[PDB]
């Protein structure tokens, strides 16, 4: 019943005291955070409190969309020796700091995601050459489907790959994806290995990567410029915004204190120093 938008408990008036009750004392040893209120130690007047936690509820903490990647595509001239670059990005929040740290506060979570795609383009060669408005395709290849090979092979016939066709110069594109985990919650951390090295086998085939699980494998996104070759080369970038919605979490962990290094929890040398200098005696 107590919703997020409820007023915090009104602080009671309390006067002088000389009793055997000891509020003030604890023994953090138990592990219990001593639960005192202002009125417990000092004298308080009555106060009708109006502040509510409404803007810090799990929902609101993740309520902002966030950049997750920068995918590069381009459409060079047909005369060019280099091949028309189509980008393929594996879907993982771990590619950028920002969302990851916000997600790390929790061991597990269930969240239906909403993706937004802002696509910006530009010329490269200093030619007063033109280019007609381009049309992009963002194809979601789920784990195991054939990943595109050429900017123009069959794979793009999207028989079943849910795709999006975005014309440039229009409002950014957006799609909703429900919770797609193979579990009951997405694992932000996986302690263990996929393969158990067996006693009657080669170490090679018995070896995997620590903290690498399928739990967080979700296929790739394929992006290409649909318009064919154009005399004047035009590169473009596709920024992907992810905003977790209908979110819920489990088990708090301490926030990441030193610069992240790679997909694991691992850290690099030099970066292991977070706090600064300050004196024990200077306020």
């Amino acid at each position, epitope marked *: 019943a107590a919703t997020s938008r409820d007023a915090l408990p009104n602080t009671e008036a309390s006067g002088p005291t000389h009793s055997k009750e000891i509020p003030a004392l604890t023994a953090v040893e138990t592990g219990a955070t001593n639960p005192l209120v202002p009125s417990d130690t000092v004298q308080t007047r009555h106060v009708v409190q109006h502040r509510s936690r409404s803007e810090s509820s799990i929902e609101s903490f993740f309520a902002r969309g966030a950049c997750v990647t920068i995918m590069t595509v381009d459409n060079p001239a047909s005369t060019t020796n280099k091949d028309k670059l189509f980008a*393929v990005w594996k879907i993982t929040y771990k590619d950028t700091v920002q969302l990851r740290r916000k997600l790390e506060f929790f061991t597990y979570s269930r969240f239906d995601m909403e993706l937004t795609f802002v696509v910006t383009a530009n010329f490269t060669e200093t030619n007063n050459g033109h280019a007609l408005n381009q049309v992009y395709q963002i194809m979601y290849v789920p784990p195991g489907a054939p990943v595109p090979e050429k900017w123009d092979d069959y794979t793009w016939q999207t028989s079943s790959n849910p795709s999006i066709f975005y014309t440039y110069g229009t409002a950014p594109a957006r799609i909703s994806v429900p919770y797609v985990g193979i579990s009951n919650a997405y694992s932000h951390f996986y302690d263990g290995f996929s*393969k158990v090295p067996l006693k009657d086998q080669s170490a090679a085939l018995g070896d995997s990567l620590y903290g690498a699980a399928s739990l967080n494998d979700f296929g790739i996104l394929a992006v290409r410029v649909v318009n064919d070759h154009n005399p004047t080369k035009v590169t473009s970038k596709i920024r992907v915004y992810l905003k977790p919605k209908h979110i819920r979490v489990w088990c708090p962990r301490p926030p990441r204190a030193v610069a992240y290094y790679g997909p694991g929890v691992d850290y690099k040398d030099g970066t292991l120093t977070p706090l600064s200098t300050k004196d024990l005696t200077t306020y």
Partner: nanobody
Amino acid sequence: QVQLQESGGGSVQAGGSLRLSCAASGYQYSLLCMAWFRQVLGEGREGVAFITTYNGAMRYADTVKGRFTVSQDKDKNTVYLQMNSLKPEDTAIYYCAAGRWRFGDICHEGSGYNYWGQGTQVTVSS
């Protein structure tokens, strides 16, 4: 298709040290399992050392192990092969293959390798 632009052989004599560079053209990120090889003149086409793109873990061939070290240029998509202690028998047409990957499984020889390199030959004179 992934392209593996290799570089760059030569027939220096015993104990030598050269290196091979091979690009991801290609989309080096989580996929490719950049591996090394050398075709022992018609005998002959063995796998040298192989690196994992995702983590940077190397494994070598019982032959090359130690002298040869596989290096990785993550950001500029290149995988090197510091060919050390080049002895006469380090004469063979070198290779650079790169397959895909298993999400978490280490890049080994029994695993890859879908795509093929140029096959730039390094010979060790006697």
